[PDB]
Homo-oligomer: A and B are copies of this chain.
Amino acid sequence: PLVSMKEMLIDAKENGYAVGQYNINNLEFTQAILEASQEENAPVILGVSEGAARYMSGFYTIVKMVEGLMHDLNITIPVAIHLDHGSSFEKCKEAIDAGFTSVMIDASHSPFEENVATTKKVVEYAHEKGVSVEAELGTVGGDDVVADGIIYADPKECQELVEKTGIDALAPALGSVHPKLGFKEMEEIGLSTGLPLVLHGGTGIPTKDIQKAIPFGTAKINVNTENQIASAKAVRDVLNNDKEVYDPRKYLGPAREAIKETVKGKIKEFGTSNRAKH
C-alpha cells in the first residue's frame, strides 16, 4: 500500500535496520526499485528530487505512474512517495496535493530560526494529510574548503527543531560528504530527539560504517548516484557492443536490471529484507 514514512521508520529504528530511499528518474527506475523491494519482502521509499519531478513532468504524473505499477506489479509491500530536498513550503504543498505521502523540507542552509518556522509550517499542513516530514540540520561536505565543508548538526538545534516543529524524521549531517561519521554525535542526537535519523551522502560510505550508523538510530538511507552509475554502465555496454541496436528496450531493459540488482544489494546492506508485514 501507499503509506507515509512514519510507521516504517519507527519500525526500522526499533528493530535495528534501515529503509532505503531510492530516487526515481523515470519509468524504468521506478519499476526496478519496486520489483526489487517486493521480491525482498521489504518496505521502500521512492525519492523524488524537484529536478527529477520537472523531468518527469510533475508530481501528479509520478503518483499516477506509481499507482499504475502498484497494481500491475502486484505490489503488496509498504511504499512511500517522498519529496527529496524540498526547497519551500509551496513545493512541499504542491507535492502533497498531488498525492505524495512524505516530504523533506530542506531549510538547512537558512538561519536556524527560519528553518524552524518553515519546517513548522510544512508539518502543520502535512500532518493534516497524513504526510510524514523530514528536516535537515548541518551540511554535507564536498572544493578546497576547510573541514571539507563539513558542518555537524548541532545537538541543541536538533533537539529544539524536533520539539518545536513535530517532524517525523531528522537528517543530521555528521561527516558525510558528496569520510568519517560522528557516531558519538549520532547516538546523542538519536537518543535526545527520539526520532528515526536519515543519512544523506551515503554513496561511498563503507558497509561497516553504514552498519555502525544503523543501530545508533539511522533508519533511512538515501540512494541515488549508485543507481545512476550502474544503469549508465549497462547502457554503455549494450551500445558499445552492438552498433546497430536502436530499440530503447534493448539498452534501457539492461539499465533497469542493473538498478534492480544495485537496489537488492542496498536492501541486504540495510537489513530491510523481510521487514514488510501484513
Q: Which A residues have a C-beta under 8 Å from some C-beta of B?
A: 25-29, 31, 51-52, 55-65, 67-69, 71-73, 225, 228-229, 231-233, 235-236, 239, 245-249, 251-253, 255
Copies in the complex: 2
Determine the main DSSP class of A at the interface with B: helix
Q: How far is the CA of A111 from the CA of B60 in the complex (A)?
A: 46
With a cutoff of 8 Å between Cβ atoms, the chain B residues found around residue A59 in the complex are: 72
Q: How far is the CA of A26 from the CA of B229 in the complex (A)?
A: 20
Q: B68–A58 contact, CB under 8 A?
A: yes
Those 5 A-B pairs whose CB atoms lie nearest each other, nearest first:
A64-B68, A61-B68, A58-B72, A232-B246, A57-B72
Q: A57–B69 contact, CB under 8 A?
A: yes
When C-beta atoms are compared, the residue in chain B nearest to A56 turns out to be B27
With a cutoff of 8 Å between Cβ atoms, the chain B residues found around residue A51 in the complex are: 249
Q: A65–B236 contact, CB under 8 A?
A: no
Q: How far is the CA of A225 from the CA of B249 in the complex (A)?
A: 12
